[PDB]
Amino acid sequence: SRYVPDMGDLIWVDFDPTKGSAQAGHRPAVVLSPFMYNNKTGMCLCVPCTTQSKGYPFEVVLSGERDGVALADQVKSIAWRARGATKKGTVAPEELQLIKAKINVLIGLSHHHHHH
Amino acid sequence: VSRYVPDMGDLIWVDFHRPAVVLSPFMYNNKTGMCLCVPCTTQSKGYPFEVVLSGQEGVALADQVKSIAWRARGATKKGTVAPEELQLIKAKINVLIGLSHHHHHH
Amino acid sequence: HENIDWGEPKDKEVW
């Protein structure tokens, strides 16, 4: 039935109509979190894509239907179930892994066993 | 004078005020004027991504991680979270988007 | 919990 985002999906989401964006079309984004979480919560963690690279270090090039780069440090929770999401494609495994690898530098944890 | 720069583990108040826990390292926070943080809310509901901050007055919502322009917004320092609480927040995020777990799904 | 809303994006926040 309804599409449910899964990790690696390249989705389109609406520009939030309250935030004043002057951009045309939709906002592309890469889904990071797994299907099971996304399905259960109606949310997903994603990074946004832009058409213009600028050479910043958290940029990950996406090769593959529209040119783009994912901004790996700009992770956000997206309410796909309430606000909508459309699947346009999937990113390469290497690109998905690179995005997650970069994010780890911002959320690196300690190396020990614990309850979580 | 010289504005406060968030460090990893700091509990900050951000003009959105909204409390948040800063996850990203000082080096990143200082260079970019951005930080990766998690917002806090007033009450717990038993949602699994909640992390209760001890002990007065602090419930962090781990799955609502967000990059915030602390420098432009004007963040202030409320204190620092206990190491165990910081670790728990990070671990819960890691389950969802960590490279180590990625390979258990694909 | 509400989906936390940070209001108008600022500085280098893209969304």
From Swiss-Prot, chain A:
- Region annotation (Loop 2, involved in substrate recognition) maps to 51-59
List-wise, which residues carry ADP-ribosylarginine?
R2
Q: How is it used?
A: Can be used to produce large quantities of a single protein if the gene coding for the protein does not contain any ACA codons. Up to 90% of expressed bacterial cellular protein can be the target, which can be produced for up to 4 days. The system also works in eukaryotic cells.
Main enzyme class: hydrolase
Q: Which GO terms describe its biological process?
A: defense response to virus; mRNA catabolic process; negative regulation of cell growth; positive regulation of programmed cell death; quorum sensing; regulation of DNA-templated transcription; regulation of growth; regulation of translation
GO cellular component terms, semicolon-separated: protein-containing complex; toxin-antitoxin complex
How its function is modulated: the record gives: (Microbial infection) RNA cleavage activity is reduced when ADP-ribosylated.
Q: What is this protein called?
A: Endoribonuclease toxin MazF
* Gene name linked to the record: mazF
PTM field: (Microbial infection) ADP-ribosylated by enterobacteria phage T4.
Curated annotation (Swiss-Prot), chain C:
Q: How does it assemble?
A: Probably forms a homodimer in the absence of MazF; binds DNA as a homodimer. Forms a heterohexamer composed of alternating toxin and antitoxin homodimers MazF(2)-MazE(2)-MazF(2).
The induction annotation reads:
Expressed in exponentially growing cells. Induction has been reported to occur after amino acid starvation in a ppGpp-independent fashion and to be Lon protease-dependent, but also to not occur after amino acid starvation and to be regulated by ppGpp. MazE alone and in combination with MazF, represses transcription of the mazE-mazF operon. Fis activates transcription. Part of the relA-mazE-mazF-mazG operon, there is also a second mazE-mazF specific promoter which is negatively autoregulated.
Q: Which organism is it from?
A: Escherichia coli (strain K12)
Query: What is this protein's function per UniProt?
Result: Antitoxin component of a type II toxin-antitoxin (TA) system. Labile antitoxin that binds to the MazF endoribonuclease toxin and neutralizes its endoribonuclease activity. Is considered to be an 'addiction' molecule as the cell dies in its absence. Toxicity results when the levels of MazE decrease in the cell, leading to mRNA degradation. This effect can be rescued by expression of MazE, but after 6 hours in rich medium the overexpression of MazF leads to programmed cell death. Cell growth and viability are not affected when MazF and MazE are coexpressed.
Top-rank lineage group of the source organism: Bacteria
Underlying gene: mazE
The record's disulfide annotation reads: none
Q: What is this protein called?
A: Antitoxin MazE
Disruption phenotype annotation? Decreased sensitivity to dramatic intracellular increases of ppGpp. Double mazE-mazF disruptions survive high temperature, various DNA-damaging agents and H(2)O(2) exposure better than wild-type cells. They produce more P1 phage than wild-type cells, while introduction of lysogens into a growing non-lysogenic disruption culture is lethal. Double mazE-mazF disruptions show reduced biofilm formation, and survive antibiotic treatment in log phase better than wild-type cells.
By sequence similarity, the record places it as follows:
Belongs to the PemI family.
- Reported modifications of this chain: Degraded by the ClpPA and Lon proteases.
